[PDB]
Ligand binder design. Sequence first.
Ligand SMILES: [Cl-]
Ligand SMILES: [Cl-]
Ligand SMILES: [Cl-]
Ligand SMILES: [Cl-]
Ligand SMILES: [Cl-]
Ligand SMILES: [Cl-]
Ligand SMILES: [Cl-]
Ligand SMILES: [Cl-]
Ligand SMILES: [Cl-]
Ligand SMILES: [Cl-]
Ligand SMILES: [Cl-]
Ligand SMILES: [Cl-]
Ligand SMILES: [Cl-]
Ligand SMILES: [Cl-]
Ligand SMILES: [Cl-]
Ligand SMILES: [Cl-]
Ligand SMILES: [Cl-]
Ligand SMILES: [Cl-]
Ligand SMILES: [Cl-]
Ligand SMILES: [Cl-]
Ligand SMILES: [Cl-]
Ligand SMILES: [Cl-]
Lengths: 92, 93, 104, 106, 84, 83, 98, 95
Amino acid sequence: RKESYSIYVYKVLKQVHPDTGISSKAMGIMNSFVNDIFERIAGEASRLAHYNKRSTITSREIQTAVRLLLPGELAKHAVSEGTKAVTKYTSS
Amino acid sequence: RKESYSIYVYKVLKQVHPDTGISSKAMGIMNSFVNDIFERIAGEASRLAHYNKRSTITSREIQTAVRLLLPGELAKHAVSEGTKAVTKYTSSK
Amino acid sequence: AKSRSSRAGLQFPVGRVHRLLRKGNYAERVGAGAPVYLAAVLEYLTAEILELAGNAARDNKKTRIIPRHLQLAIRNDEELNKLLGKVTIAQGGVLPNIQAVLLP
Amino acid sequence: KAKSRSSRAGLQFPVGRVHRLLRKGNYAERVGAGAPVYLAAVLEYLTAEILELAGNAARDNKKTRIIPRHLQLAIRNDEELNKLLGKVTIAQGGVLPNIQAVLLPK
Amino acid sequence: RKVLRDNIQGITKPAIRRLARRGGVKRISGLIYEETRGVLKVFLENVIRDAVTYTEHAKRKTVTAMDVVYALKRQGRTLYGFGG
Amino acid sequence: KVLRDNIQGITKPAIRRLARRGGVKRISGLIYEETRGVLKVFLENVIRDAVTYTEHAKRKTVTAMDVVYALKRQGRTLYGFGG
Amino acid sequence: PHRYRPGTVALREIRRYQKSTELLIRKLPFQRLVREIAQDFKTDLRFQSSAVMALQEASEAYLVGLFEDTNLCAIHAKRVTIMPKDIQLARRIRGERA
Amino acid sequence: YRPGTVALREIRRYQKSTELLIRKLPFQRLVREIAQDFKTDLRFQSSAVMALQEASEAYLVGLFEDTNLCAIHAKRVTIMPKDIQLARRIRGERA
Ligand SMILES: [Cl-]
Ligand SMILES: [Cl-]
Ligand SMILES: [Cl-]
Ligand SMILES: [Cl-]
Ligand SMILES: [Cl-]
Ligand SMILES: [Cl-]
Ligand SMILES: [Cl-]
Ligand SMILES: [Cl-]
Ligand SMILES: [Cl-]
Ligand SMILES: [Cl-]
Ligand SMILES: [Cl-]
Ligand SMILES: [Cl-]
Ligand SMILES: [Cl-]
Ligand SMILES: [Cl-]
Ligand SMILES: [Cl-]
Ligand SMILES: [Cl-]
Ligand SMILES: [Cl-]
Ligand SMILES: [Cl-]
Ligand SMILES: [Cl-]
Ligand SMILES: [Cl-]
Ligand SMILES: [Cl-]
Ligand SMILES: [Cl-]
């Protein structure tokens, strides 16, 4: 009953290691990993919206949640990556 | 920002210990307690409804949330009180 | 009985609890029984901690419950202690208890 | 045929799906258009980091197919990922080879 | 349909030793096997009790992998690999 | 440059008392500095999250509730400051 | 390096098992333990195989994690042999019996 | 009396007490310093400083309790840094 992100994780794997493959057991782990993080980030964004009496989750709540949930450098790059995405999406 | 249940905590205190008072700092602790438990139970009931693709949170979700969140013995008592209240409420629909 | 609380035999606010459940991002809809069941559980757990803190207050000849009594009640009760294991009660202190090996 | 939202944001992860999953979970009354873009981008970045480290771990073991063991080795050997996933159990991930010095011979 | 009993004994000395070895233990007192059996039973009872609560809540008779994953999350443990 | 070392404002007798409340009978002289280290880490983690909440809300005054939310992120639930 | 005493054997064993990922408790007996425990909570309760496997992966991960902490407790008492008190201390500090 | 007798007397006294044990002002100045390294110009509600202190003190006493068990475990009655480190490693607070 959980989302599958397989197609997408395959695509990312090829961008990073065109050479290497991934077993189904491992794909099952990656899917659990994406759902987990998705849930942590959205749950926290939801808490933030509620705390501030805001009815809408925006990319700001997502960003703050990401800062709160991820450790040091990983949070810095994630924030950077999120920002780039929104910037490019907003332009194009 | 958090709900105040002072009036109710106070009324319950009169039932269980009629000649005992409670301090303002203690009332604040009690309010934090109520809010905390309310959030844990609603949160788990929300997870249950979504897990079962249910759009509505009903007393069955609250009950299950309670059995999941409270230690065994205490849950028995809470479940009983929950059920009683629902029964009285319906019998007087 | 006129209010929903009254109809349920409760002191805790059924109407208010229904409103808080709906306002909280929990589900698209909230049935009428949910808040009565939740209010009853809250009331019951409140009575539990009050009963026990009240006792602790008496054990010290006090007639007023203060944070210290809430802490003593919780930590001396196995069930409440489990339920509230990651909770810190401001101004509650700890249970008087010294490891035996430390005594003369 | 319309350009996908993922495409417009320079991502592989599904912006469209993410926005829908965000609405299906009732996290708030409304979900802004940028939220799923930012979220999808973070999920992709994290996925890339782990695949990156895991692919490596697979090479170090003369292997060409990433398995649970490699994901575990990659996570547990990375200080931040290991902290992010501190309460996570990777099925069939095993444990990091490590013996307390006190137990080894002089 | 048979009344199962004493199966905690299926968690044997060698199985327990293999577990301690993976945990990096170099030497084991003979009293740890019964101790281990006791902690395992407690852990299992708790997880199984919660998993079945999810199962019965959904009015099912068959406990699923996801019921266990939800139950483990309840204990503050996140298990990867069974969302399929 | 300038000296920012307020952690040393946390006193040896204060630490001794905390340890006594914790039932400790005898204290090595080395645990005082060790204790200052773990306390500084604890506060850094909680204050970092509390100000993250404050900034997100576009405020400049850190509130008790911001600290409570920050404590929850650390797995700690604090009672008494919701009023 | 001591040459092939029980210590040398224990160490080879640690290396062997820290290298593999297979489950270490026999599967059928584990399944029987799971079903036996469930008989209390409910009669006529069935378990999907992957549910049993999920339980086993979680149980073993839990046990070896507990043994790692236990080992540190033994080493703390300048001991190399783990004993029940090491497990109990680890659990106390973990909050499992605190 | 013996230091042991004095210590035991102190434990009984502090375990019966609920008052905060670190000084108000020095704690407040510590909080301000740390916040300053994240965002300058920040102010703290005074009740926020107090929430931080109640939490910080509860945390430290809790840690001393585990630390104590770790010293007793090694047949010592004196806590040492290695005791704090063991407790923290097991609590998962560090690596
Ligand atoms: Cl009644
Ligand atoms: Cl009402
Ligand atoms: Cl209902
Ligand atoms: Cl979709
Ligand atoms: Cl949609
Ligand atoms: Cl947005
Ligand atoms: Cl690696
Ligand atoms: Cl090694
Ligand atoms: Cl055996
Ligand atoms: Cl052995
Ligand atoms: Cl999953
Ligand atoms: Cl001080
Ligand atoms: Cl001393
Ligand atoms: Cl296997
Ligand atoms: Cl069978
Ligand atoms: Cl697990
Ligand atoms: Cl030994
Ligand atoms: Cl022993
Ligand atoms: Cl706290
Ligand atoms: Cl000593
Ligand atoms: Cl030391
Ligand atoms: Cl440490």
